[PDB]
Design a protein around this motif. Structure first.
Motif, PDB file in Angstrom:
ATOM      1  N   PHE A  15      35.857  39.990  39.521  1.00  0.00           N
ATOM      2  CA  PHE A  15      36.156  39.149  40.664  1.00  0.00           C
ATOM      3  C   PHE A  15      35.174  37.992  40.653  1.00  0.00           C
ATOM      4  CE2 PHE A  15      38.337  42.726  42.851  1.00  0.00           C
ATOM      5  CZ  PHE A  15      39.371  42.046  43.481  1.00  0.00           C
ATOM      6  N   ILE A  16      35.644  36.796  40.332  1.00  0.00           N
ATOM      7  CA  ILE A  16      34.752  35.636  40.312  1.00  0.00           C
ATOM      8  C   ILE A  16      35.180  34.652  41.385  1.00  0.00           C
ATOM      9  CG2 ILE A  16      36.120  34.930  38.314  1.00  0.00           C
ATOM     10  CD1 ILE A  16      34.335  32.685  37.819  1.00  0.00           C
ATOM     11  N   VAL A  17      34.479  34.714  42.526  1.00  0.00           N
ATOM     12  CA  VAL A  17      34.793  33.890  43.673  1.00  0.00           C
ATOM     13  C   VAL A  17      34.129  32.604  43.364  1.00  0.00           C
ATOM     14  CG1 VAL A  17      34.380  33.528  46.110  1.00  0.00           C
ATOM     15  CG2 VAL A  17      34.856  35.856  45.283  1.00  0.00           C
ATOM     16  N   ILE A  18      34.849  31.735  42.672  1.00  0.00           N
ATOM     17  CA  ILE A  18      34.282  30.453  42.302  1.00  0.00           C
ATOM     18  C   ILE A  18      34.872  29.285  43.108  1.00  0.00           C
ATOM     19  CG2 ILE A  18      35.958  30.155  40.442  1.00  0.00           C
ATOM     20  CD1 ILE A  18      33.843  28.700  38.818  1.00  0.00           C
ATOM     21  N   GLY A  19      34.010  28.610  43.868  1.00  0.00           N
ATOM     22  CA  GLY A  19      34.421  27.466  44.670  1.00  0.00           C
ATOM     23  C   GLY A  19      35.510  27.694  45.708  1.00  0.00           C
ATOM     24  N   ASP A  20      36.713  27.231  45.383  1.00  0.00           N
ATOM     25  CA  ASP A  20      37.868  27.346  46.268  1.00  0.00           C
ATOM     26  C   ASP A  20      38.807  28.469  45.861  1.00  0.00           C
ATOM     27  OD1 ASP A  20      37.743  24.938  48.149  1.00  0.00           O
ATOM     28  OD2 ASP A  20      37.547  23.935  46.211  1.00  0.00           O
ATOM     29  N   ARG A  21      38.892  28.709  44.561  1.00  0.00           N
ATOM     30  CA  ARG A  21      39.795  29.715  44.033  1.00  0.00           C
ATOM     31  C   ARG A  21      39.156  31.024  43.613  1.00  0.00           C
ATOM     32  NH1 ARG A  21      44.295  26.343  40.787  1.00  0.00           N
ATOM     33  NH2 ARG A  21      46.125  27.019  42.001  1.00  0.00           N
ATOM     34  N   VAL A  22      39.824  32.113  43.960  1.00  0.00           N
ATOM     35  CA  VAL A  22      39.361  33.437  43.594  1.00  0.00           C
ATOM     36  C   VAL A  22      40.208  33.880  42.411  1.00  0.00           C
ATOM     37  CG1 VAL A  22      39.300  35.859  44.263  1.00  0.00           C
ATOM     38  CG2 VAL A  22      38.540  34.090  45.863  1.00  0.00           C
ATOM     39  N   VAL A  23      39.542  34.179  41.301  1.00  0.00           N
ATOM     40  CA  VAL A  23      40.223  34.622  40.097  1.00  0.00           C
ATOM     41  C   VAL A  23      39.828  36.057  39.787  1.00  0.00           C
ATOM     42  CG1 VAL A  23      40.621  34.209  37.646  1.00  0.00           C
ATOM     43  CG2 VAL A  23      40.194  32.276  39.189  1.00  0.00           C
ATOM     44  N   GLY A  47      32.578  28.954  31.034  1.00  0.00           N
ATOM     45  CA  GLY A  47      31.629  28.311  31.927  1.00  0.00           C
ATOM     46  C   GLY A  47      31.466  28.902  33.316  1.00  0.00           C
ATOM     47  N   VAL A  48      31.454  30.229  33.411  1.00  0.00           N
ATOM     48  CA  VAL A  48      31.278  30.892  34.703  1.00  0.00           C
ATOM     49  C   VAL A  48      29.793  31.146  34.931  1.00  0.00           C
ATOM     50  CG1 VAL A  48      31.704  32.966  36.057  1.00  0.00           C
ATOM     51  CG2 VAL A  48      33.527  32.007  34.636  1.00  0.00           C
ATOM     52  N   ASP A  49      29.267  30.613  36.030  1.00  0.00           N
ATOM     53  CA  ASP A  49      27.852  30.758  36.365  1.00  0.00           C
ATOM     54  C   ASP A  49      27.672  31.555  37.656  1.00  0.00           C
ATOM     55  OD1 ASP A  49      25.437  29.569  34.989  1.00  0.00           O
ATOM     56  OD2 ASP A  49      24.916  29.079  37.069  1.00  0.00           O
ATOM     57  N   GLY A  50      26.560  32.276  37.760  1.00  0.00           N
ATOM     58  CA  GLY A  50      26.293  33.047  38.963  1.00  0.00           C
ATOM     59  C   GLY A  50      25.628  34.391  38.736  1.00  0.00           C
ATOM     60  N   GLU A  51      25.394  35.115  39.827  1.00  0.00           N
ATOM     61  CA  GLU A  51      24.779  36.436  39.759  1.00  0.00           C
ATOM     62  C   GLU A  51      25.884  37.469  39.946  1.00  0.00           C
ATOM     63  OE1 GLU A  51      21.438  36.943  39.003  1.00  0.00           O
ATOM     64  OE2 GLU A  51      21.639  34.788  38.674  1.00  0.00           O
ATOM     65  N   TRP A  52      25.772  38.603  39.267  1.00  0.00           N
ATOM     66  CA  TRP A  52      26.821  39.603  39.378  1.00  0.00           C
ATOM     67  C   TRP A  52      26.385  40.969  39.877  1.00  0.00           C
ATOM     68  CZ3 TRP A  52      26.653  43.881  35.989  1.00  0.00           C
ATOM     69  CH2 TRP A  52      25.717  43.779  34.941  1.00  0.00           C
ATOM     70  N   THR A  53      27.376  41.738  40.313  1.00  0.00           N
ATOM     71  CA  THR A  53      27.178  43.093  40.798  1.00  0.00           C
ATOM     72  C   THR A  53      28.277  43.942  40.170  1.00  0.00           C
ATOM     73  OG1 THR A  53      28.644  42.840  42.730  1.00  0.00           O
ATOM     74  CG2 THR A  53      26.313  42.252  43.024  1.00  0.00           C
ATOM     75  N   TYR A  54      28.099  45.254  40.199  1.00  0.00           N
ATOM     76  CA  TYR A  54      29.086  46.166  39.644  1.00  0.00           C
ATOM     77  C   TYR A  54      29.253  47.378  40.566  1.00  0.00           C
ATOM     78  CZ  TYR A  54      31.350  49.577  36.602  1.00  0.00           C
ATOM     79  OH  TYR A  54      32.214  50.532  36.120  1.00  0.00           O
ATOM     80  N   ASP A  55      30.503  47.759  40.806  1.00  0.00           N
ATOM     81  CA  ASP A  55      30.851  48.903  41.647  1.00  0.00           C
ATOM     82  C   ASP A  55      31.564  49.846  40.689  1.00  0.00           C
ATOM     83  OD1 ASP A  55      32.259  50.746  43.269  1.00  0.00           O
ATOM     84  OD2 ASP A  55      32.296  49.306  44.918  1.00  0.00           O
ATOM     85  N   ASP A  56      30.882  50.903  40.251  1.00  0.00           N
ATOM     86  CA  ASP A  56      31.473  51.821  39.282  1.00  0.00           C
ATOM     87  C   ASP A  56      32.741  52.555  39.703  1.00  0.00           C
ATOM     88  OD1 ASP A  56      31.304  53.100  36.590  1.00  0.00           O
ATOM     89  OD2 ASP A  56      31.039  54.910  37.799  1.00  0.00           O
ATOM     90  N   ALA A  57      32.764  53.092  40.919  1.00  0.00           N
ATOM     91  CA  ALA A  57      33.948  53.802  41.395  1.00  0.00           C
ATOM     92  C   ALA A  57      35.164  52.883  41.306  1.00  0.00           C
ATOM     93  CB  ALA A  57      33.741  54.261  42.833  1.00  0.00           C
ATOM     94  N   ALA A  58      34.957  51.611  41.631  1.00  0.00           N
ATOM     95  CA  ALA A  58      36.024  50.616  41.601  1.00  0.00           C
ATOM     96  C   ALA A  58      36.194  49.956  40.233  1.00  0.00           C
ATOM     97  CB  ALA A  58      35.750  49.541  42.647  1.00  0.00           C
ATOM     98  N   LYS A  59      35.284  50.244  39.309  1.00  0.00           N
ATOM     99  CA  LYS A  59      35.310  49.640  37.978  1.00  0.00           C
ATOM    100  C   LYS A  59      35.481  48.132  38.142  1.00  0.00           C
ATOM    101  CE  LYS A  59      37.076  53.677  35.426  1.00  0.00           C
ATOM    102  NZ  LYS A  59      35.831  53.842  34.623  1.00  0.00           N
ATOM    103  N   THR A  60      34.767  47.578  39.119  1.00  0.00           N
ATOM    104  CA  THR A  60      34.849  46.156  39.407  1.00  0.00           C
ATOM    105  C   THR A  60      33.505  45.429  39.392  1.00  0.00           C
ATOM    106  OG1 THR A  60      36.846  46.422  40.792  1.00  0.00           O
ATOM    107  CG2 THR A  60      35.522  44.441  41.135  1.00  0.00           C
ATOM    108  N   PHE A  61      33.472  44.300  38.687  1.00  0.00           N
ATOM    109  CA  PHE A  61      32.295  43.434  38.611  1.00  0.00           C
ATOM    110  C   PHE A  61      32.610  42.244  39.509  1.00  0.00           C
ATOM    111  CE2 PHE A  61      30.189  45.009  34.702  1.00  0.00           C
ATOM    112  CZ  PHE A  61      31.223  45.727  34.110  1.00  0.00           C
ATOM    113  N   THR A  62      31.603  41.742  40.211  1.00  0.00           N
ATOM    114  CA  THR A  62      31.799  40.587  41.077  1.00  0.00           C
ATOM    115  C   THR A  62      30.715  39.571  40.756  1.00  0.00           C
ATOM    116  OG1 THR A  62      32.640  41.973  42.897  1.00  0.00           O
ATOM    117  CG2 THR A  62      31.935  39.741  43.456  1.00  0.00           C
ATOM    118  N   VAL A  63      31.107  38.313  40.596  1.00  0.00           N
ATOM    119  CA  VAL A  63      30.147  37.254  40.315  1.00  0.00           C
ATOM    120  C   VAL A  63      30.133  36.333  41.525  1.00  0.00           C
ATOM    121  CG1 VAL A  63      29.628  35.245  38.916  1.00  0.00           C
ATOM    122  CG2 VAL A  63      30.543  37.299  37.853  1.00  0.00           C
TER     123      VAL A  63
END
Length: 65
Positions: A15-23, A47-63
């Protein structure tokens, strides 16, 4: 003798919440560390910049940022 081993993989999300669009980018990988490598390269290649987190149960990374 020979046989192919199709190794087990699970889908992971980025999940990369970048600017206006969430991809949301999904991929498949044997484990979290492997998915991390894949998404890191993907982020660098696109060119994705930022800090990330990871939720294992959800197998989801967020930047963020």
């Amino acid at each position: 003798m020979h046989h192919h081993h199709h190794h087990a993989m699970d889908t992971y999300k980025l999940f990369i919440v970048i600017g206006d669009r969430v991809v949301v980018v999904t991929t498949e990988a044997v484990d979290a560390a492997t998915a991390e490598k894949v998404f890191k390269q993907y982020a660098n290649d696109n060119g994705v910049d930022g800090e990330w987190t990871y939720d294992d149960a959800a197998k989801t990374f967020t930047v963020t940022e």
